Amino acid sequence: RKPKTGILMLNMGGPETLGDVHDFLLRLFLDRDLMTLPIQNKLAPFIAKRLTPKIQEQYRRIGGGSPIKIWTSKQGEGMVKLLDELSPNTAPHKYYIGFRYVHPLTEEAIEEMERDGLERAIAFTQYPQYSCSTTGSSLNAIYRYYNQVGRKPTMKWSTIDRWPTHHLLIQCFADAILKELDHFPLEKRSEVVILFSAHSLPMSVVNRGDPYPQEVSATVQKVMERLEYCNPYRLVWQSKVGPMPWLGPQTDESIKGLCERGRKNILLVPIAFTSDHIETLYELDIEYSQVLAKECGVENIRRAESLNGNPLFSKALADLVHSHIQSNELCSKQLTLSCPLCVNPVCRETKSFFTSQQL
Amino acid sequence: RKPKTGILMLNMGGPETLGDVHDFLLRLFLDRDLMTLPIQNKLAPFIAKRLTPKIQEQYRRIGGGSPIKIWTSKQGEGMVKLLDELSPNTAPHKYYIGFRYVHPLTEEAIEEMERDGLERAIAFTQYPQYSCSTTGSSLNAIYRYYNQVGRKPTMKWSTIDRWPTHHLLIQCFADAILKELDHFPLEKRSEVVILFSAHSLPMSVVNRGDPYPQEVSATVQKVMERLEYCNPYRLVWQSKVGPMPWLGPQTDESIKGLCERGRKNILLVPIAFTSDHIETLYELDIEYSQVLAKECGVENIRRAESLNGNPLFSKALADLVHSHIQSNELCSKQLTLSCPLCVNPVCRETKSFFTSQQL
Numbered sequence: 180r181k182p183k184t185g186i187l188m189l190n191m192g193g194p195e196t197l198g199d200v201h202d203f204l205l206r207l208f209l210d211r212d213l214m215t216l217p218i219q220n221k222l223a224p225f226i227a228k229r230l231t232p233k234i235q236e237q238y239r240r241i242g243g244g245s246p247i248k249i250w251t252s253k254q255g256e257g258m259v260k261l262l263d264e265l266s267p268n269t270a271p272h273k274y275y276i277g278f279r280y281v282h283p284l285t286e287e288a289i290e291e292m293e294r295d296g297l298e299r300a301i302a303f304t305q306y307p308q309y310s311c312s313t314t315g316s317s318l319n320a321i322y323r324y325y326n327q328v329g330r331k332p333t334m335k336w337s338t339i340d341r342w343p344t345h346h347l348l349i350q351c352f353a354d355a356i357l358k359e360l361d362h363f364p365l366e367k368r369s370e371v372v373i374l375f376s377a378h379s380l381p382m383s384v385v386n387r388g389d390p391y392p393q394e395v396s397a398t399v400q401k402v403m404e405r406l407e408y409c410n411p412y413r414l415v416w417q418s419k420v421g422p423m424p425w426l427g428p429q430t431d432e433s434i435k436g437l438c439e440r441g442r443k444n445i446l447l448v449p450i451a452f453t454s455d456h457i458e459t460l461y462e463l464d465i466e467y468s469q470v471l472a473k474e475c476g477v478e479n480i481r482r483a484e485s486l487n488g489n490p491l492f493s494k495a496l497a498d499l500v501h502s503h504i505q506s507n508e509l510c511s512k513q514l515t516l517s518c519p520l521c522v523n524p525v526c527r528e529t530k531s532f533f534t535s536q537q538l
Numbered sequence: 539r540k541p542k543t544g545i546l547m548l549n550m551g552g553p554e555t556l557g558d559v560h561d562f563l564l565r566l567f568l569d570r571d572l573m574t575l576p577i578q579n580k581l582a583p584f585i586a587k588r589l590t591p592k593i594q595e596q597y598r599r600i601g602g603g604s605p606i607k608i609w610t611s612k613q614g615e616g617m618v619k620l621l622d623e624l625s626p627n628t629a630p631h632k633y634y635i636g637f638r639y640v641h642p643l644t645e646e647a648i649e650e651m652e653r654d655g656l657e658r659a660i661a662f663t664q665y666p667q668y669s670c671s672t673t674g675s676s677l678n679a680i681y682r683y684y685n686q687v688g689r690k691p692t693m694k695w696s697t698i699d700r701w702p703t704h705h706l707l708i709q710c711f712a713d714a715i716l717k718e719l720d721h722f723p724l725e726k727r728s729e730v731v732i733l734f735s736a737h738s739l740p741m742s743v744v745n746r747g748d749p750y751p752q753e754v755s756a757t758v759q760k761v762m763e764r765l766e767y768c769n770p771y772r773l774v775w776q777s778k779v780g781p782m783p784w785l786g787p788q789t790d791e792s793i794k795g796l797c798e799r800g801r802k803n804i805l806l807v808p809i810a811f812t813s814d815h816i817e818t819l820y821e822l823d824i825e826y827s828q829v830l831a832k833e834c835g836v837e838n839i840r841r842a843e844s845l846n847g848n849p850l851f852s853k854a855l856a857d858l859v860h861s862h863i864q865s866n867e868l869c870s871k872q873l874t875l876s877c878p879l880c881v882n883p884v885c886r887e888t889k890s891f892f893t894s895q896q897l
């Protein structure tokens with residue numbers, strides 16, 4: 180009856196309503212794992228307020244907020260039901276959501292897991308491919324929480340810190356692509372070009388050693404292997420802001436370029452995230468597939484469905500947690516190597532926090 | 539007895555002696571697929587002349603020239619012996635070397651293939667991961683040869699234009715890594731960090747859509763899977779020159795960064811080429827492993843042996859060719875998609891050259 184094993188699902192989060200946008204931005208801009216600003220305690224609230232209207236308008240364009248919490252909860256519930264049956268010795272299992280910049284915040288979830296008196300806590304990132312700016316930032320929040328509160332954990336921690344080639348995740352993407360290919364006019368299907376798209380990183384981050392581009396490229400290859408190379412593809416990158424150099428090719432410039440070169444039948448595949456959110460519902464579906472694509476003369480542009488409530492995806496999550504438990508690993512071998520040019524002192528503390536855990 | 543199937547092994551090549559350096563550079567700078575320069579017919583000989591002394595000195599430091607022709611010949615000979623047994627319907631097989639910028643030049647090889655009266659010719663790039671700047675440039679040379687001689691081919695052409703995850707290539711890399719791990723002191727072996735290293739590309743090339751970074755990342759993941767994630771790794775990129783932005787992290791900076799961060803036992807793995815050449819014998823072995831690494835206080839830095847004369851690598855080559863023949867394929871599905879921002883008119887012509895071939 181009392182939960183024994185807590186699976187803490189980590190993600191950045193998104194504002195559920197338009198009223199949550201300002202505080203989302205403020206927590207983001209206060210976070211030094213992402214950015215160091217001059218006079219940051221002053222500029223953070225200011226830039227949050229400055230950007231609120233633009234960002235609320237994007238969310239209003241997709242129906243008034245992000246659905247991430249809904250999807251995460253449905254996935255969490257399907258995962259736990261499977262885990263109680265796969266793993267009766269670590270049952271009952273209970274999921275907790277720990278979002279970095281909206282409620283329930285990472286720190287609020289840890290407080291609850293400790294209150295619930297769990298024996299074991301698993302920090303399970305919902306980003307299959309690791310970036311120090313996504314999963315690294317969620318794992319640092321766990322280390323900082325105990326550091327700030329000045330007490331040690333009362334539960335045994337470990338982390339599933341990446342899973343870019345999990346076989347059932349791969350199957351979920353391949354399945355979604357095959358379904359969407361069937362939605363193109365039959366006479367176009369062979370002609371379709373696949374653009375896998377993932378959020379970009381600034382080159383300053385790529386060049387310091389961030390593991391993300393190599394892992395996202397691995398996911399793309401395993402998906403194309405599963406599909407037997409039925410269509411040609413490129414991996415391209417979305418969401419660049421600001422005037423600094425980021426990893427390209429850009430998704431928008433790639434859609435326009437393909438159109439200008441006669442490839443007017445394009446299937447977009449979000450490959451680095453597992454539910455709908457602003458990047459899919461606003462950036463890909465509206466900004467590129469409605470506005471940009473209409474202006475460049477595209478014939479058909481479609482997007483693979485996000486994994487969202489697919490029961491095969493819940494089965495992937497539970498398979499990941501079960502295999503983790505059975506292996507007794509505390510973290511990947513990759514978490515034990517920080518970036519070769521890391522300049523953030525917290526990363527090594529975070530690494531040690533996980534590699535040193537009792538058990 | 540008359541040869542029936544020719545396998546054209548494509549590679550950029552390297553100067554075999556110090557005297558060949560100038561004409562190597564001059565052919566390279568006269569190649570539009572690789573670069574456009576102002577007043578290129580004047581500037582190419584001038585830049586070749588300017589760089590000759592520094593490049594001759596690099597080759598002198600490694601014994602007086604590139605061994606690429608030796609290794610390519612040994613691999614070609616072993617591949618042909620296997621193919622005559624594996625594929626008697628297409629035997630006898632004959633290999634031909636087509637180097638882009640040294641003799642025997644691509645154009646000289648095609649001449650000899652035509653004279654030999656082969657039934658078919660296979661353009662087999664020796665770069666497992668495709669870049670428009672490597673394999674694309676060599677395939678463009680085949681299209682341009684016929685275009686410039688004003689005659690259609692007299693043999694059926696097809697291409698093996700990439701093979702970044704062929705299982706025996708992956709085995710050869712994993713085998714070389716395990717052998718080199720065995721040469722560290724035993725007490726350091728689990729502490730070893732692996733840096734997979736590949737020639738970089740400028741960001742202008744990456745951002746136009748070059749398929750290379752994603753393919754090299756795929757090779758890395760399949761090698762680490764075969765090794766069961768026994769050590770941690772990063773993929774990083776060598777050989778940047780000039781002042782423009784290129785894809786990082788840089789290999790040199792990453793070795794020094796790792797050293798400064800207490801990771802002093804490092805295994806370098808050249809992952810994008812299959813024999814020794816100036817990148818391994820000069821840049822990694824001298825510039826980085828002798829000079830840089832001594833300066834930064836490294837404890838052990840070693841390099842996986844290049845594939846070179848490994849018989850399992852001849853077996854991979856022959857298996858590639860054999861599968862290619864049995865499949866009847868003219869080229870990969872990926873060759874049918876040019877880069878989304880390609881601005882070189884020859885790419886489409888080369889693509890069509892192969893996709894339109896009779897059979």
Ligand SMILES: CC(CCC(=O)O)[C@H]1CC[C@H]2[C@@H]3[C@H](O)C[C@@H]4C[C@H](O)CC[C@]4(C)[C@H]3C[C@H](O)[C@]12C
Pocket residue numbers: 215216217222226
């Ligand atoms: C200096 C800097 C970032 C630091 C860095 O990259 O190391 C940038 C990032 C966000 C910038 C701020 C935001 O763009 C919002 C403001 C925009 C105005 O055009 C200038 C002031 C303004 C307040 C900016 C000052 C400065 O250029 C900031 C603070």
Ligand SMILES: CC(CCC(=O)O)[C@H]1CC[C@H]2[C@@H]3[C@H](O)C[C@@H]4C[C@H](O)CC[C@]4(C)[C@H]3C[C@H](O)[C@]12C
Pocket residue numbers: 574575576581585
């Ligand atoms: C303008 C240009 C490239 C153009 C382009 O990329 O569009 C660059 C590439 C290589 C350059 C040249 C090479 O670096 C060699 C020469 C170097 C000297 O320091 C300047 C003149 C010199 C002759 C350069 C002139 C000019 O800056 C060139 C020609």
Ligand SMILES: C[C@@H](CCC(=O)O)[C@H]1CC[C@H]2[C@@H]3[C@H](O)C[C@@H]4C[C@H](O)CC[C@]4(C)[C@H]3C[C@H](O)[C@]12C
Pocket residue numbers: 207213214312379380381384418420
């Ligand atoms: C590039 C990067 C983080 C920093 C980093 O990787 O250095 C990512 C992580 C969270 C991202 C931010 C969050 O998604 C929230 C904002 C979303 C807007 O659509 C752009 C600005 C916005 C503020 C983002 C800018 C940038 O893409 C961030 C800061």
Ligand SMILES: C[C@@H](CCC(=O)O)[C@H]1CC[C@H]2[C@@H]3[C@H](O)C[C@@H]4C[C@H](O)CC[C@]4(C)[C@H]3C[C@H](O)[C@]12C
Pocket residue numbers: 566572573671739740743777778779
């Ligand atoms: C960057 C690039 C090719 C062009 C491209 O990618 O746009 C690669 C392909 C062949 C490379 C060149 C060849 O390896 C020959 C030269 C080798 C020297 O060590 C550097 C300059 C040198 C001239 C190289 C510069 C650059 O790295 C080239 C030109």
Ligand SMILES: C[C@H](CCC(=O)O)[C@H]1CC[C@H]2[C@@H]3[C@H](O)C[C@@H]4C[C@H](O)CC[C@]4(C)[C@H]3C[C@H](O)[C@]12C
Pocket residue numbers: 213214215226229230381383420421422423
């Ligand atoms: C879009 C925006 C500012 C808003 C504004 O002028 O209104 C700014 C605020 C802080 C910026 C970020 C911070 O400067 C930290 C990162 C710095 C990197 O050099 C580029 C991305 C990077 C993640 C920046 C991207 C972007 O230019 C941000 C998110």
Ligand SMILES: C[C@H](CCC(=O)O)[C@H]1CC[C@H]2[C@@H]3[C@H](O)C[C@@H]4C[C@H](O)CC[C@]4(C)[C@H]3C[C@H](O)[C@]12C
Pocket residue numbers: 572573574585588589740742779780781782
């Ligand atoms: C190293 C060198 C010139 C030598 C010199 O001035 O001494 C120049 C000559 C032509 C240059 C190349 C050509 O300009 C074409 C490419 C231009 C890209 O913007 C960067 C790499 C790129 C491949 C260049 C790298 C490098 O700066 C090269 C190879």
Ligand code: FES
Pocket residue numbers: 311315388389516517518521522523526
């Ligand atoms: S920035 Fe990657 S480990 Fe610190």
Ligand code: FES
Pocket residue numbers: 670674747748875876877880881882885
């Ligand atoms: S530059 Fe890549 S296809 Fe032309």
